[PDB]
Amino acid sequence: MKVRASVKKLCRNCKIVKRDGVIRVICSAEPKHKQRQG
Amino acid sequence: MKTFTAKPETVKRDWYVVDATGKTLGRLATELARRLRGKHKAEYTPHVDTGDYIIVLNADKVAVTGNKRTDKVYYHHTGHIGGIKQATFEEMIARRPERVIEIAVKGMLPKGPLGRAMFRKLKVYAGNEHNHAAQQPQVLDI
């Protein structure tokens, strides 16, 4: 998991979702692309 | 002449009964405090007590708005260094339902001996039954 203030898509398989008030990035191809805003 | 003043030895008081099911906490507390102080009688006098007795039923069924059922916090301190303690609205309703209405009403009454005496006329129950049939209370719809 990467925790930071600027979160964005890094490839074409990345997706942006909002869960319980937080902005997250989840990817189905690369586990290194998993991000959380905080 | 001189302005009229009430006398504690000759005031008249009455008994009422209220139901708290589905009501909003603060908007019920305002009415309770108003009638306990006695601001609805034309004989109101700031240094005398001229209120009524009120019974409240079904205290565990009072309502709140928004996300307050999990987000309102009650605090207190014990007197020992480090002794700060807290609870939530759900926890309070689970263990001591009557304190919820009691604290709200006590916050809206005057601070001092007369306010403490005004607080003594409130009777709060968590269920649907009371044992004051000898005083013959009348129904009050708020």
Added chain:
Amino acid sequence: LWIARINAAARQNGISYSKFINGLKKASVEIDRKILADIAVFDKVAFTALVEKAKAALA
């Protein structure tokens, strides 16, 4: 003190203090708050009559 007692008496007849004062001003009554409170405590039929006067003026 006078104002508080007048509010209590008016709301038992079905009106608020502010509307009551407005109605008396429009009906051209010049009784002051001291006397109004005295009547509110010691004579209720007269106070009801005054409230009716104010309501008719406001209508």
Added chain:
Amino acid sequence: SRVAKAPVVVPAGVDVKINGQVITIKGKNGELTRTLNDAVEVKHADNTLTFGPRDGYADGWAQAGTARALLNSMVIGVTEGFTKKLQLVGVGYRAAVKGNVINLSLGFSHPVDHQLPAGITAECPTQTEIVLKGADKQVIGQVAADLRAYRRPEPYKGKGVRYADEVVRTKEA
């Protein structure tokens, strides 16, 4: 919206009962009951069910869509049913069934015993394969996930408990 505007056919042999916001569906495979949101209206035309929003709520169409999907799943379940398949990969891994309990050996210092809930059935057509049968989609999915959580597939050889049709990526050191 689009999902919620498609009605649900009620075939022969299935009984539909509606009471306020409670719906009961009965068929040869069993009985199911559910309570719906207070912003959805459901109607039973002649042999079809239709769903619509109620006036006064700001999210009627989404709730209608969810209710449609749920009712369709109920109707399929009370006639056909659902099944899931699990596979074991590793050395010395084994499974067995007795009554409504599954016994698993997965390389621990103690055996694993799992108790099935009410309405689910299990079978082991081999020492390295499990098949679950039921009539509730959510319950069957939850049981499969609970079974899989005891030993998840690992990334260097693939060992563990997996779904039958699941892709497991691997890498080297």
Added chain:
Amino acid sequence: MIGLVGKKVGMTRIFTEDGVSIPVTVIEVEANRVTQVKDLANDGYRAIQVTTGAKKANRVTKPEAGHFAKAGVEAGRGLWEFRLAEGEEFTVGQSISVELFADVKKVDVTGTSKGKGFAGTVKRWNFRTQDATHGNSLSHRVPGSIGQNQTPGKVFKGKKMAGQMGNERVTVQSLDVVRVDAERNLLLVKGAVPGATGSDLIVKPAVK
């Protein structure tokens, strides 16, 4: 489960055939007699009350005599109470003996500890002494500092200071039952228990 009330006799040892010495405390447990049964409808909880011992007639007041005469038992030297668990029944006037512990393995013992009176911080709280030489001035067994400066400007509650020590209720948990002798009303347990020779003790089956 329920327990019993006994008296402390003293300490001795038991020699085993393998060459081990076990230190034991001897407790005398006479018959406990039931004086009252409390239930839910009348009191709000479930318990029994017991007495034991003997008392001289010219020291029993009239209220106490009437209470004992309602039950039908001889007067004893005190009254005690025990809480009941589900599935337990008793009747007024019944006797209970030491054979209750015939199959128990571990017990808890409660009593009143010995008195030391007014005690200092070295004995009461394990404070360290200051120097005995090197220029100390009248400060050898004194406590030292008791706070900070202007912030907070007071002494906190719970501070550790000199005062009364001993003479209070203490409990010791999980002691082995070495012997139960019903012909002589004796219970032998392993280890030491609170109190002095001749004091009253309460014995219960272990909670942990």
Added chain:
RNA sequence: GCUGAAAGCAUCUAAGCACGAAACUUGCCCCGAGAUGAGUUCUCCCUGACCCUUUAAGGGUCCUGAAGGAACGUUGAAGAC
């Protein structure tokens, strides 16, 4: 994580359901009804005549003195008193 629309796909979440730590609330030990909101349960003791006055939770005289308590003495593995 399961089921699932807004967004015919996908999505742990918006409606529903399941796990998850020495931190939180209990379970272990001690104090505790001055908790003025001063609580409950068992037992014991007291069953006489009159007068005055401003007439009331009024004042006084004679006869009676219970259950219990305190004081004194011999004292304690209880204690500065």
Added chain:
RNA sequence: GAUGUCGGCUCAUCACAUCCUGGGGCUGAAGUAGGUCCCAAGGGUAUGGCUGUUCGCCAUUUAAAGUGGUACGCGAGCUGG
């Protein structure tokens, strides 16, 4: 027309930007052993040689020998290098 200033001794109390023990995600994570980030303040957290030393170097231990505030905590509590 006076609020005694460094270091040591005795006695402590709070924060969390976490030294050890507890729970997790990614790894250029095969296992053992590591790197980095997130959650968590219940409890625990060295003895000596040199020097007036706080620091610091050295010797030998420990799961670990945390960082800061409290008149750079504490002389109507002690010492006086």
Added chain:
RNA sequence: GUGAAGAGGGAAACAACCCAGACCGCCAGCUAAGGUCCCAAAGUCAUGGUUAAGUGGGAAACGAUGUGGGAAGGCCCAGACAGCCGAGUCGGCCUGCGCGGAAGAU
């Protein structure tokens, strides 16, 4: 300009900020700044909108399919978008209110 050498009302408390300049008495009336659910005097007043964060009731560069309004564009009943057949869908611009970034000692 005010305090110094100036009282009264408001800003919780608060010389220097806002309103306003105390000769004495009254149990009369109207207003200023600021206010009208209870502590505490006076609208739980009326009509049309926005917020779901207790925002209101502390803070930036930067990041995001939160959601209200406005003017223009590309594709489409000669079949558009997504998935594997039948009405919409794409991406910029200007503007209102909210969300993260946000750790301290009785």
